[PDB]
Symmetry: C6
Amino acid sequence: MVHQAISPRTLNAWVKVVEEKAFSPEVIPMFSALSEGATPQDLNTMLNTVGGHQAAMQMLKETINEEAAEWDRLHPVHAGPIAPGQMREPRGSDIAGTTSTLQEQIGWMTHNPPIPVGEIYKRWIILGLNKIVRMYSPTSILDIRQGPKEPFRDYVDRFAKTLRAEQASQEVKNWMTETLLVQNANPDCKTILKALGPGATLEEMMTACQ
Amino acid sequence: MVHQAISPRTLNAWVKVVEEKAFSPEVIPMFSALSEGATPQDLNTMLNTVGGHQAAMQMLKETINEEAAEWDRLHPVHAGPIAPGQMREPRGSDIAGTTSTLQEQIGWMTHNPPIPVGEIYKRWIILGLNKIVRMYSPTSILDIRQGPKEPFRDYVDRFAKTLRAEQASQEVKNWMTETLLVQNANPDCKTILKALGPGATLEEMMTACQ
Amino acid sequence: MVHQAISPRTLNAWVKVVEEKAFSPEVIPMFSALSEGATPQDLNTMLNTVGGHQAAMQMLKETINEEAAEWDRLHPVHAGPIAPGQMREPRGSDIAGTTSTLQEQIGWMTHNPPIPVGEIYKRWIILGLNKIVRMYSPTSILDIRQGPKEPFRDYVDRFAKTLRAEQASQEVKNWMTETLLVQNANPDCKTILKALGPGATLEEMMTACQ
Amino acid sequence: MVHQAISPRTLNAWVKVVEEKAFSPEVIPMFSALSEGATPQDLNTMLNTVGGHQAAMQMLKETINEEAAEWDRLHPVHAGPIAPGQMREPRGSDIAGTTSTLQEQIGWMTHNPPIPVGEIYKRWIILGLNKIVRMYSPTSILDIRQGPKEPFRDYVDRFAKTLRAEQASQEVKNWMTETLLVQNANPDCKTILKALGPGATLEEMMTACQ
Amino acid sequence: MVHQAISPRTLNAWVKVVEEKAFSPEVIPMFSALSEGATPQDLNTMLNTVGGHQAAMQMLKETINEEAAEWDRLHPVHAGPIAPGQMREPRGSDIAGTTSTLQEQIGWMTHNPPIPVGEIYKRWIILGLNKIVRMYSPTSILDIRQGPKEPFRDYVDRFAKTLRAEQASQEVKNWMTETLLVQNANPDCKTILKALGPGATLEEMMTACQ
Amino acid sequence: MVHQAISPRTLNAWVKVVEEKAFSPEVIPMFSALSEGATPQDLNTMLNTVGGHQAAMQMLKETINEEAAEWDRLHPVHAGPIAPGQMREPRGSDIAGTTSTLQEQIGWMTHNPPIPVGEIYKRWIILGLNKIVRMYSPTSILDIRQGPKEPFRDYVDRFAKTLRAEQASQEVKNWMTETLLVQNANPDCKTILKALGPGATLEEMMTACQ
């Protein structure tokens, strides 16, 4: 038997928090939707589909891990004959979706009485993320303006990565880049540069500032 | 069998030492009181609930474990077959928490004579914390005074993460923060600040620093 | 026995990207052409034939891995004891181009109705690369001007190293090299060269630059 | 002979030597005195109760290890089935005070013929210690001094930990500390301080030194 | 055919490339000619006799290794229960020189039809080396021409050690050593030296340069 | 022959070079003389007794290792059903004295026909040592001098350990120390010292020379 489930549109939504808010806590419903209990697999999905903050993947992942520890700790994995293939008291693996893999899992989860794993596990998540908001704390390019006595060259270079590393829109990307570049030379260099007025390729201007 | 047990209010208490004093001594006699001998699990709890001085648990835990070693060293269970004596006794691992199952703790504890698992373990702990106290010393954001030649630019960072690492009223936190920022400027940076008089976004100030 | 295919000429084709403009993201539809869905051995081939940009490969390989993981994840590897072999539910490794003998893989691809690994795997490939190109962002010996406080010797070191790393005719290589060495001096270093006017082996000039 | 044995007072004494002369060689006749025979378990004790010179423990420990090596080297268990009457021949671990219960130690020692565990081990011990004395050589908080271009913050830090790291009254510790801070300042720094004349929170002075 | 075989005179020859041009790309076809197609011990021999460029040993060695891989890849072990061994299907290892005692390896070459490993292995090798010439790219003590703003003091030290690292006649070594040391010397350092005129032990001169 | 042989005098001798002038390669015909080809245990002994250039032991050990490889390489094992225990295709381990401990070893060595391991092995030694001599090239404390810009404190430190790390007489140790510190000192520092004229412990002067 198979119920119909989780669209990729809904994924698109999940995605969409990322797409809105890739690495920024304007999260709340998005989680709430995604925390429609879920199983591992979906949850696994979200975390699979997750990017942005590897560190966040981390943060949860310890949290989870100790949640697992806690699971075993609050339920020290009590053995038996496992008469009619039970629930196999959830671990980190289960939290991976492994141990009564998803059908079977859901099978526990909507085993009635349940063993509704992804939700428990969900509590594990549930445990991190907020704190993740509490944890993660951006980020910004603008300040990539050249250091105190930082040299230019690097400054643009750095900048160059950083712009590489920055957001969407080529158009923006070009013009902004000059436009933000300007001040991202540090004032003194920028002043030289301003004193250059224009230039084109970096390099000549730069060449002055090396 | 059940017995009713430890609250999370009691946790709130454990907490109460902790939010009282997450990174320093003078919270202790009362916590030590509140460490009513313990079991592994409560100790585990404490350890679960543990944080603040990452070193503190860290040094303690080895010590605890070497306390286990010492246990082993003064007896590791130099023995074999059994009719589960002294609530089927433990080794260092149980004393680590480890190979105690829930029962085994309780069992050990209220078996008569017991095995005072959490108490030994407690003693191990008991062994550390004091030292922790005995030497463990915080630390502050205030210190992000711009010591010898620190440049404000870093500083802004220095604060900014540190501030990130700083807490409570954010509102408060700013105003003092600027006001303490000025302070934590090195006089010369401070000068730039004085010389800035007012600013707002960092950057213009930063620009003075860049 | 074969349904005869591929060649090193077709490799010359794979190659054809690479030497043509290996960093030519612009090559991908051609590649997509040369990935005629791709079998594991050809996919293996491509990765075998792979070279020059391991960073890119690196990124990719992660995807492949993630793909593998994903495969098992998104196809829970819900195998058990076989009955007439059936290409044994490909794992990440098979998908790595590993498990199943190459024919047998292939066999699976041309199994009717296949176990056609190589496409999936192809998507894996696709899964890195495209993006990988899409931000895999070079590189250049020209960029090796000369730092702010970078002196020539080091510049030679760089330049020359990079030059070591640079391609083409030696003849080219020299002349540009003076001329671009010229250019890629830092302006002051550039000055020393300008101030040097001519010279021959580096060293004497260089000697000025030490 | 479920005997009578070494006290913690006597331990206290050994320990006391450490407390006497924590990092100072001139222990030795006592050392030999508490070395008197020494069971491996007591020898374990000495190393157990050991602390404050991990380098020493370390350095010794290679000797021990070599001593084990040597043990096997000068006698590599050239044996097969232990017949009755042998108090099981030691190896490096036993000689480490490891493999054995006390009995096996004593059994080896006062099994007559013995196995003179504690003595061998004693040579081992001796083997570190000698060197240890012979080279080991502190340390000094005075050296928290602000060296050549050393600057203050660090100097105080240096003070702060180090003074923290030092022994005795806090009271003492302060007054000397100012009195020792002052001058261990590099002169130019000392001077700033002299030029500060007095001060109180470090920071204003320090701020001057930033 | 348990013949007479390869001399060390032939080694002297292998050597002859090597002392001729030990860590430089241009001695080689003439050596490859002198490879005379080598089999494993001999290939090993070359590897045995190999030295100077561990990185080269490396460079090849990846090639070998991937050659092995390729090998494994292109020999996706079709091996099963061998019917009378018949110079047993190589694996990377054989090709590493690893598999088979040498005769049998040799047999594997010189059997007729052979299963000549050593040629393949030779191919592997053959596969690196060229590229090694393509890879490796010298080398020179002269290049201990003094840095830009760095002291002599090291510069000579560095030299001196480099000189350690340098080879040939000592006699030579001195005079050049002053004579190029004088030179290596940054002009400014060199000048100090010139200004030193003579000296004898380094040190007094050095002493001027410290 | 449950023989009578070797000496700590023989050691004393072994020592005598080492201790005479361990970094005088000028020891070598004697040392090899003192080798008399030997066994593992004595050679091991020599190697046990070894100390001074860690690196030396290392490099030899590297040699040994490769010698072991060579042993197998030039004669792998080809082991099957040993008849009368034999000399069992010795390796690095045998060279350790591992495989065939000394009695049995010697038993092979004076097994007639022999298998005189320590000699082979001796050739392994023989294989290193030379290099060791030929490259191993000290060392010298004098060269601790107050840098080019390395400062005194460190200089004296550097000195201080190092002198500690240096040889001989206490008397000497005092006098040199004044005399050899003063001036090893970069001139400019030496100047401060000259400018100190005298002082007493370092420190006052150093505290001045910071």
